[PDB]
Design an enzyme around this catalytic site. Structure first.
Site, PDB file in Angstrom:
ATOM      1  N   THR A 193      -0.763 -12.635  -1.460  1.00 44.85           N
ATOM      2  CA  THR A 193      -0.356 -13.622  -2.497  1.00 44.85           C
ATOM      3  C   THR A 193      -0.473 -13.040  -3.887  1.00 44.85           C
ATOM      4  OG1 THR A 193      -1.419 -15.222  -1.091  1.00 44.85           O
ATOM      5  CG2 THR A 193      -0.689 -16.027  -3.262  1.00 44.85           C
TER       6      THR A 193
ATOM      7  N   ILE B  46       3.411 -13.398   1.262  1.00 43.93           N
ATOM      8  CA  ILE B  46       3.807 -13.079   2.640  1.00 43.93           C
ATOM      9  C   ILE B  46       2.705 -13.538   3.599  1.00 43.93           C
ATOM     10  CG2 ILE B  46       5.440 -11.182   2.283  1.00 43.93           C
ATOM     11  CD1 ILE B  46       2.845  -9.274   2.647  1.00 43.93           C
ATOM     12  N   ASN B  47       1.784 -14.314   3.029  1.00 43.85           N
ATOM     13  CA  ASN B  47       0.559 -14.807   3.664  1.00 43.85           C
ATOM     14  C   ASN B  47      -0.642 -13.849   3.652  1.00 43.85           C
ATOM     15  OD1 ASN B  47      -1.314 -16.518   4.758  1.00 43.85           O
ATOM     16  ND2 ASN B  47      -0.308 -16.677   6.770  1.00 43.85           N
TER      17      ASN B  47
ATOM     18  N   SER C  32       0.774 -25.380   2.101  1.00 43.67           N
ATOM     19  CA  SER C  32       0.273 -24.243   1.336  1.00 43.67           C
ATOM     20  C   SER C  32      -0.903 -24.560   0.425  1.00 43.67           C
ATOM     21  CB  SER C  32       1.391 -23.633   0.495  1.00 43.67           C
ATOM     22  OG  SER C  32       0.854 -22.744  -0.474  1.00 43.67           O
ATOM     23  N   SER C  33      -1.759 -23.565   0.225  1.00 44.97           N
ATOM     24  CA  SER C  33      -2.899 -23.655  -0.705  1.00 44.97           C
ATOM     25  C   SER C  33      -2.515 -23.412  -2.157  1.00 44.97           C
ATOM     26  CB  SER C  33      -3.989 -22.656  -0.320  1.00 44.97           C
ATOM     27  OG  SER C  33      -4.835 -23.169   0.693  1.00 44.97           O
TER      28      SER C  33
ATOM     29  N   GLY D  66      -6.528 -15.532  -0.274  1.00 47.02           N
ATOM     30  CA  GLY D  66      -6.958 -16.387   0.836  1.00 47.02           C
ATOM     31  C   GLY D  66      -6.668 -17.858   0.597  1.00 47.02           C
TER      32      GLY D  66
HETATM   33  B1  LIG Z   1      -2.203 -15.924  -0.278  1.00 46.61           B
HETATM   34  O1  LIG Z   1      -2.530 -14.445   0.282  1.00 46.61           O
HETATM   35  O2  LIG Z   1      -3.590 -16.241  -1.071  1.00 46.61           O
HETATM   36  C1  LIG Z   1      -2.065 -16.783   0.925  1.00 46.61           C
HETATM   37  C2  LIG Z   1      -1.726 -18.252   0.561  1.00 46.61           C
HETATM   38  C3  LIG Z   1      -1.039 -18.989   1.748  1.00 46.61           C
HETATM   39  N1  LIG Z   1      -1.898 -19.199   2.945  1.00 46.61           N
HETATM   40  C4  LIG Z   1      -3.371 -19.168   2.789  1.00 46.61           C
HETATM   41  C5  LIG Z   1      -4.050 -19.489   4.132  1.00 46.61           C
HETATM   42  N2  LIG Z   1      -4.288 -18.251   4.931  1.00 46.61           N
HETATM   43  C6  LIG Z   1      -0.445 -20.365   1.349  1.00 46.61           C
HETATM   44  O3  LIG Z   1      -1.127 -21.369   1.621  1.00 46.61           O
HETATM   45  O4  LIG Z   1       0.687 -20.398   0.828  1.00 46.61           O
HETATM   46 CL   LIG Z   2      -2.049 -12.541  -8.155  1.00 53.32          CL
END
Ligand SMILES: *[B]([O])([O])[C][C][C]([N][C][C][N])C([O])=O
Ligand SMILES: [Cl-]
Ligand SMILES: *[C@@H]1O[C@H](CO)[C@@H](O)[C@H](O)[C@H]1NC(C)=O
Ligand SMILES: *[C@@H]1O[C@H](CO)[C@@H](O)[C@H](O)[C@H]1NC(C)=O
Ligand SMILES: *[C@@H]1O[C@H](CO)[C@@H](O)[C@H](O)[C@H]1NC(C)=O
Ligand SMILES: *[C@@H]1O[C@H](CO)[C@@H](O)[C@H](O)[C@H]1NC(C)=O
Ligand SMILES: *[C@@H]1O[C@H](CO)[C@@H](O)[C@H](O)[C@H]1NC(C)=O
Ligand SMILES: [Cl-]
Lengths: 342, 187
Positions: free
Chosen positions: B1, B20-21, B69-70, B92
Site C-alpha cells: 500500500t 496490491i494488498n 478496505s482499511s 497492513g
Molecule cells: B495495504 O498494504 O496497507 C493493504 C491495505 C488493504 N488490505 C489490508 C488488510 N490486509 C485494504 O484494506 O485496502
Molecule cells: Cl505510503
C-alpha cells in the site's frame, strides 16, 4: 537542503524521486490529478511491493474552483467466476492465481484524467518509462520489503529475475531495473487504457493469472468500470469539513473515531502532563475499539445495504452514545463494545 | 500500500491511496508484461477461519464485488473553502488508526506537519484483542494503558506510513514518513 514548506505547490510521496516527478508535472502546467497519476506510476515502480497497475485504488479530489470534493472508486472486484466458499485457508487466499482480484488502477487513472487532466496522457507515463529501463537504486522501504520476503522471492524464478542480484534479493543502494514493465507502461501511454482492459495486453493478463490458478477471464477485464462518487462522506470538525470515501473503504470508521474524540476537546494541554497524556491516549484506544466494533457490518454498498449503518456511524448522537460508555480508568472485554454482525 | 498527498497552485488537492494488498501481492509477476498482481481477495471474509475476525457476512465474496478496505484517503477543508489538510496512510491494517492520529496530532495537539508524521503511533482494532505500540512511544503512555488494564505489546518494525500536507500562513507544509524513507517536493 530544503525546508519542505512551499509557497505554491507540494507533493508528498513515499519516495523522493516520485515526489519530484509529481512536482515537475505541476511546473509543466499539470493539475493536481495530473501530478497525482504521474507520481503513482513512479511509485508502482520504486515501491513495487506496495502498489501498481496490478492493483486498485481510491482518489479523493477537491476542486478549488467549484469548491467541491469528489471520490473516484477504482478498487479491484471479484471475478465473475468467484464464489463465497472458494477458499478454505489463509495460504490459499494470499498466494497464486486465485488470490488475484481484477485490477482497477488503470481505469482509475483514466477517469481522473478524463475529468481533471491538463497534460496529455502519454506525458504522465514518460518519466516512469525512463526510470524503468535505466534502473534506479533500491530505497529503504523496498529494501526491507525484499528482506522480509527473501525466501518467497529467491525460490520463485520469475520474481528473482527482476528482484535478485545473483539469485539473492537486492539490497538498499543496488540497482533495480524493470524492463518488462517499461514496455507495458509505454504501450499504455501510446495505445491508452483500452490496451489493458480490451486491447493488446488483455489476453496476456488472463493467461498469466490463469496459469497460476486464478479464474479471471477477458470478460472480467472488459467489464471493469471505475466509479465517480459525487457526494463523498463528510464530517464536521470545529471550523472545518473532512472528506473521505464511504464503504467499501474506512471513511465510516475514521468518522466515528474522530466524532467520538472531538467531544473531549483535545488541546495542547491534553499532552502537557503524563497524567493527562495517559488519559488522552487511553481515550484514543477506547474510541478505536468502539469504532472497530461497528466495522463488521460493512461491505460493498452495491451488494449489502449499509445506508443506515453508515448514517449511524457518522451520526453525532451515535458518537455521543459510545463516548459515555468509555470509562476513564479501565479498558473492557470485547463484548462490552457490542460488535455486531447483522 | 502507498499513499500520497498533493496540493496544486490553484488550491485544488488529491489524497490518493493505492495497493496490491500484501507485500508483492499474490507473488505472481507476468514474465511478459512484468505486471505484478494483487492478492486483494484475501481482504474478503470467509465462512471458515479467523485471522481474529469471525466470518462477517457483509464482506463475504460474491461475483463482481468489492472487498472491504482499511484505506481512508482524506482532505480537510476550511469553512472559507480553502484546503487545510491532505492526509492518509498505508501499511497492513493500521491505516485508519494512523490517519486519525495524524489528524489529531496536528489539529488538536498543535504539532507541525513533520512531527505529526514522525510522532510514535499506537493501534487497537478490537479483533484481535491487543493494543500495539511503536518502540519509541512515550513510556508514561505505556504505563497509563498498562494500569487501565490494557495488555500492550511492542511492534517489531513500525506502525503505518503517513504522507501529509497542511496549510499554514507561511504556505503549504509537507512531510513524507521516514519510516518508509520518502521525501516531498514543491515550489
Ligand atoms: B495495504 O498494504 O496497507 C493493504 C491495505 C488493504 N488490505 C489490508 C488488510 N490486509 C485494504 O484494506 O485496502
Ligand atoms: Cl505510503
Ligand atoms: C475449498 O473448499 C470448497 C468446498 O469443498 C471448494 O469450493 C473449493 O474447491 C476449495 N478451495 C480451495 C482453494 O482449496
Ligand atoms: C474543476 O471542474 C471543472 C469542470 O467544472 C473542470 O474543467 C476542472 O478540470 C476542475 N478543476 C481542476 C483544477 O481540475
Ligand atoms: C455531507 O454528507 C451528505 C452527502 O450528500 C450531505 O448531507 C452534505 O451535503 C455533505 N456535506 C458536504 C459539505 O458536501
Ligand atoms: C443506529 O443507532 C441506534 C442506537 O442509537 C441503534 O439502535 C441501531 O442499531 C443503529 N442502526 C443500525 C442499522 O445499526
Ligand atoms: C482483551 O484485552 C483486555 C486487556 O487489555 C482484557 O481486559 C480482556 O479480558 C481481553 N479479552 C477479551 C475477550 O475481551
Ligand atoms: Cl519488469
Amino acid at each position: 537542503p530544503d525546508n519542505h514548506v512551499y509557497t505554491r505547490a507540494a507533493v508528498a510521496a513515499d519516495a523522493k524521486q516520485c515526489s519530484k516527478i509529481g512536482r515537475d508535472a505541476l511546473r509543466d502546467g499539470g493539475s493536481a490529478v495530473d501530478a497525482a497519476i504521474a507520481a503513482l506510476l513512479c511509485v508502482g515502480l520504486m515501491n513495487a511491493h506496495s502498489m501498481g497497475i496490478g492493483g486498485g485504488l481510491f482518489l479523493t479530489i477537491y476542486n478549488s474552483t467549484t469548491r467541491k470534493a469528489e471520490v473516484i472508486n477504482a478498487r479491484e472486484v471479484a471475478p465473475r467466476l468467484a464464489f463465497a466458499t472458494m477458499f478454505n485457508s489463509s495460504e490459499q487466499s494470499q498466494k497464486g492465481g486465485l488470490s488475484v482480484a481484477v485490477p482497477g488502477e488503470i481505469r482509475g487513472y483514466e477517469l481522473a484524467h478524463q475529468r481533471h487532466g491538463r497534460l496529455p496522457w502519454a506525458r504522465l507515463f514518460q518519466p516512469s518509462i525512463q526510470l524503468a529501463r535505466q534502473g534506479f537504486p533500491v530505497g529503504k522501504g523496498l529494501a526491507a520489503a525484499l528482506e522480509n520476503k527473501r525466501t518467497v522471492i529467491e525460490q520463485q524464478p520469475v520474481l528473482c529475475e527482476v528482484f535478485c542480484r545473483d539469485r539473492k534479493v537486492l539490497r538498499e543502494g543496488e540497482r533495480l531495473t524493470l524492463p518488462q514493465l517499461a514496455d507495458t507502461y509505454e504501450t499504455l501511454a501510446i495505445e491508452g487504457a483500452q490496451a489493458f482492459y480490451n486491447g493488446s495486453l488483455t489476453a496476456q493478463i488472463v493467461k498469466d493469472i490463469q496459469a497460476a490458478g486464478g479464474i479471471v477471464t477477458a470478460e472480467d477485464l472488459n467489464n471493469y468500470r471505475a466509479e465517480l462518487i459525487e457526494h463523498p462522506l463528510n464530517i464536521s470538525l470545529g471550523d472545518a469539513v473532512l472528506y473521505m470515501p464511504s464503504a467499501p473503504l474506512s471513511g465510516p470508521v475514521l468518522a466515528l473515531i474522530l466524532n467520538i474524540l472531538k467531544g473531549y476537546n483535545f488541546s495542547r494541554e491534553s499532552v502537557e502532563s503524563p497524567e493527562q497524556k495517559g488519559l488522552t491516549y487511553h481515550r484514543i484506544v477506547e474510541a478505536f475499539r468502539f469504532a472497530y466494533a461497528k466495522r463488521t457490518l460493512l461491505g460493498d454498498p452495491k451488494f449489502v445495504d449499509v445506508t443506515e449503518v453508515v448514517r449511524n456511524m457518522t451520526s453525532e448522537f451515535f458518537a455521543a452514545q459510545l463516548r459515555a460508555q468509555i470509562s476513564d480508568d479501565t479498558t473492557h472485554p470485547i463484548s462490552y463494545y457490542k460488535p455486531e454482525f447483522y | 500500500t502507498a499513499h500520497l498527498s498533493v496540493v496544486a497552485e490553484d488550491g485544488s488537492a488529491v489524497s490518493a491511496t493505492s495497493t496490491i494488498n500484501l507485500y508483492f501481492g499474490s507473488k505472481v509477476r507476468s514474465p511478459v508484461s512484468g505486471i505484478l498482481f494483487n492478492n486483494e481477495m484475501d481482504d474478503f471474509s470467509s465462512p471458515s477461519i479467523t485471522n481474529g475476525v469471525p466470518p462477517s457476512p457483509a464482506n463475504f465474496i460474491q461475483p463482481g464485488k468489492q472487498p472491504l478496505s482499511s484505506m481512508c484517503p482524506t482532505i480537510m477543508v476550511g469553512q472559507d473553502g480553502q484546503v487545510r489538510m491532505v492526509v492518509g496512510a498505508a501499511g497492513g491494517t493500521q491505516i485508519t488508526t494512523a490517519t486519525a492520529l495524524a489528524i489529531i496530532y496536528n489539529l488538536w495537539f498543535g504539532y507541525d506537519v513533520k512531527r505529526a508524521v514522525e510522532e510514535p503511533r499506537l493501534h487497537n482494532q478490537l479483533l484481535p484483542n491487543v493494543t500495539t505500540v511503536e518502540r519509541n512511544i512515550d513510556q508514561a503512555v505505556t504505563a497509563a494503558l498498562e494500569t487501565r488494564h490494557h495488555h500492550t505489546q511492542i511492534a517489531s518494525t513500525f506502525i503505518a506510513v503517513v504522507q501529509a500536507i497542511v496549510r499554514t500562513a507561511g504556505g503549504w507544509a509537507a512531510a513524507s514518513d521516514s519510516r518508509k524513507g520518502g521525501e516531498p517536493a514543491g515550489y
